[PDB]
Each structure stands twice: as structure tokens, then as C-alpha cells.
Amino acid sequence: VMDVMNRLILAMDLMNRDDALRVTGEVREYIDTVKIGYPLVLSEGMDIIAEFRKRFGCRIIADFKVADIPETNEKICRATFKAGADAIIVHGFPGADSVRACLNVAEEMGREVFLLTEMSHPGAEMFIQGAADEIARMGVDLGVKNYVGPSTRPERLSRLREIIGQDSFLISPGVGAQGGDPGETLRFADAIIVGRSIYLADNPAAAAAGIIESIKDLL
Amino acid sequence: VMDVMNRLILAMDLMNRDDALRVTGEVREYIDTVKIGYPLVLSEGMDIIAEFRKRFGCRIIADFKVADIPETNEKICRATFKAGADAIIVHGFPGADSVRACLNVAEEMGREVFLLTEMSHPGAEMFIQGAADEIARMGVDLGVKNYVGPSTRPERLSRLREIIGQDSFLISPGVGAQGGDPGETLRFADAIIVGRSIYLADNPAAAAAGIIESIKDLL
Ligand SMILES: O=c1ccn([C@@H]2O[C@H](COP(=O)(O)O)[C@@H](O)[C@H]2O)c(=O)[nH]1
Ligand SMILES: O=c1ccn([C@@H]2O[C@H](COP(=O)(O)O)[C@@H](O)[C@H]2O)c(=O)[nH]1
DSSP states (O other): OOOOGGGEEEEEOOOOHHHHHHHHHHTTTTOSEEEEEHHHHHHHOTHHHHHHHHHHOOEEEEEEEEOSOHHHHHHHHHHHHHTTOSEEEEESTTOHHHHHHHHHHHHHHTOEEEEEOSOSSGGGGTTHHHHHHHHHHHHHHHTOOEEEOOTTOHHHHHHHHHHHOTTSEEEEOOBSTTSBOHHHHTTTOSEEEESHHHHTSSSHHHHHHHHHHHTGGGO | OOOOGGGEEEEEOOOSHHHHHHHHHHHTTTOSEEEEEHHHHHHHOTHHHHHHHHHSOOEEEEEEEEOSOHHHHHHHHHHHHHTTOSEEEEESTTOHHHHHHHHHHHHHHTOEEEEEOSOSSGGGGTTHHHHHHHHHHHHHHHTOOEEEOOTTOHHHHHHHHHHHOTTSEEEEOOBSTTSBOHHHHTTTOSEEEEOHHHHTSSSHHHHHHHHHHHTGGGO
8 A cells, every 4th residue: 555654745726836846845854645636737737746746756646536538547647647647536426437537547557547436525414424435345345445435424424434445545535624623524534635735835844744643652 | 609600619639739739730721719628738837828829810719627725726717818819628527616616717707618417438337428418507507508418429419508508618529530420519518519520630621621511501
């Protein structure tokens, strides 16, 4: 499994290259894993991934929530891994063939697929939540070993862990800004994803240090 | 609603700038609306939208299938409209708050949201299909005016048309490569989306001219 320093993944969703690099540099002593998404990539280009690798060496998870047909999913994954991402996050809701397409490219390029099963925001309750256990089972059937579930609903996160087993790797967003607690989330997830609580902080380094301090006994 | 020339939208999913530009230029006399997605954008940058605008008299629909939490959706939409997209495609399955976020940005920035309700690929049957009527009804209640539904399932496309009413705008992918028929799809959809059937042809202009000839009585 992926070895995430301090069990803490930075969600770098600032949309200015100067700010994103500066803030990431400010917290670099605390993390070795950065989650980069569309806010940054669509503002500054996919070349930003190589820039992070050059400046920080961190591993890069592309949170692209891939959710297209199989043929197009393959193209998206290929473009993403070509840009230097170590892993990609894929939606499970569009079905098995769409996930398999991503697994195919990941296998070909030696990278990892993370399956997003239940999302962390309130609207996740409308359609995703009722499908989520089945989506996780589908992941297991497909041989998926990396998963994403919601910090905002620890009971749902726990169920996700139950389904996938202790051997699978599980990361969890919704910590801080969305209301999730770092320590409680780490009862079930291998690592927490944290964005705004760090990158909007007046002092991001102190923010990251504070989070890590709060979970010291879990490290 | 947008006035799509020949009821035909080009899905430009080539991943090389030179190829994408060549093919789009070759079919420009038949099409004034181009759908750009992540295969091209992640390969060549969001600057490709401006370049298409510069080279062609074409409106741009960004098929980004936005599927994040509300706050991140806002950022994605902002980045996409800043780059010059006329419209963005958003997934409905993450729920009402996620869709509303996109609508709010679209209203502020004077652009349009298209709601993707049911997808065209076989895997869409697993989770999306069972939610699709309610996703559509949600769209209607949110005041969504533009929709995307599957050419590959005429019965489902027909039901979607019913739900959204005759005044709503409906575009439909899955024509050609995925098995959908141009004429039958236009019984319900205002415009068809066609990718590979055009852009992989020895003569894209002839392929587009051929599709249009086959629906001539519908124009
Ligand atoms: O169910 C999910 C899946 C992914 N994210 C992503 O995780 C990060 C959360 O950031 P923040 O809430 O800590 O700022 C954002 O990049 C967001 O897109 C979620 O918040 N919830
Ligand atoms: O349910 C959907 C929604 C969007 N698309 C998009 O429409 C285009 C279809 O291309 P093609 O099958 O005509 O090549 C691609 O960009 C694809 O991502 C679908 O195929 N199905």
C-alpha cells in the first residue's frame, strides 16, 4: 500500500500557480502526498503536476472523479498518468465498465485507481448513498484496492471499511471545512485529505502542524 | 436556446492539437457547435478553447461532467467559463446542491449549464438509470433548461424529453460509434452529439455531410 507521511494528504485546490506552490512549500515538511484536482489543473495546466514533482517530490493523486463512458475514461486516465500522476480518483456511480476502463490504463502505466464510493457533501444523500455499498462491492469484485469515502459520515466510512476489508487502502475527504474530525476519520481511513483547513489558513504550516498534533497517538 | 447548426454537435475528443484543429476545420461548414472534453483539454490545455474560438465560428460546450462537492464545482465552473466555454455539462447524480452550485456560477457569469441525467454506455444501467427520472425531475425543479440523455436507449431518451418538456433543450450522445441512430435520436433530442463517426473517418467532412444528408427532412 501507499505510504502517506503523517496520514495527511493535502488537497491543493488553490487556483493560482504562485499561491499553490508557496502554500505547498510551506507545509512540505509535514506531507509527501498531494491531491491535485481540476480547480488547479484547469487554471494552470496539467504541466503543474511535473512542477510539483520537481519542487517537492511528493506523490500526486489526481482527484478527477472520472465519470465518463469507458472509451473516454481510458483517454482521461492516459492523459492524466502521462502528466505524472501516481493515482487517479474514479467515480463508481457510472458502473463497472467505466471503472474497468480506468483499471486497464492504470495497469498498463503502473499507476493506481482510487474508487470514490460515497461523497462527503449533503447532496450525496440523494442518489449516491443508497448505491454506495453496492458500488464498494463492485470495487471488490473488480479487484480495486484503493477507495475514497466521506469523513462527514463516520458510520458510512466505517461501513465502507467493513466492505473492502482491512487490507484495502482508504482515504477520506471532508475533514475540517466540511465538518469532519481528523482523529475520528482515522479510526477507519488510512489517511485524511485536508484542503481549506490548511490552504486558507493565515499560517498553513501551523495549521498542518496542529492537525498532526491532534492525531499524534495515531501516527 | 442555442441555435445548433444542422442539429449536429461535434465531439472533438482527439488528443493532439494539430489533429483536433485539422478535423474541426474540415467540418466547420457543417457545424457551429463543438463539444470539447477532458481528453483534449488535459492533453493540450484550457487554452484550446480560445484557439477554437479564434480559428472557427463555433460555440463551445465543455463536457466536463462536473461531479464534485458544491464548493469545488463552483471553482471548476469558474475556471471553465473563464477559458471561454459557452456552456458546461454537469452530472446530476451527486445531487441538488452540487447542481445548484454550477447553476449559480453560470448565472453570475452569463453562461449555461447542461444537466447530464442518464448516460449512454452499458454500465449506466447499474446505478444511473434507476435514478435518472428523478435526476431529470430534480433538474426541472432547479430550473435547468438544458439536458443530456442517451441516444443508445430511445425509450429512456423519450422519457427524459417527457420529463423536461418540449421547451427544454436536449442534446444526445451515443450516435454512431456507440450504436445510436441520428434520425431516431432527433425524434426527441434537439441536437445529436457525434464524435468518432466523424473524427476517425478518412474524410470527416464527408462523414458529417453524410449524417446531415440522412436527417435532411428533420432540418
Ligand atoms: O466526496 C468527496 C470527494 C472529493 N472531495 C475533494 O476533497 C477536497 C476537500 O477539500 P476541503 O473540504 O478540505 O477543502 C476537495 O478537493 C474536494 O473536491 C470531497 O471533498 N468530497
Ligand atoms: O452519456 C454520455 C455523456 C457524454 N458522452 C460523450 O459524448 C462523446 C461521444 O463520442 P462518440 O461516441 O460519438 O465518439 C464523448 O465525448 C463522450 O465522453 C457520451 O458518450 N455519453
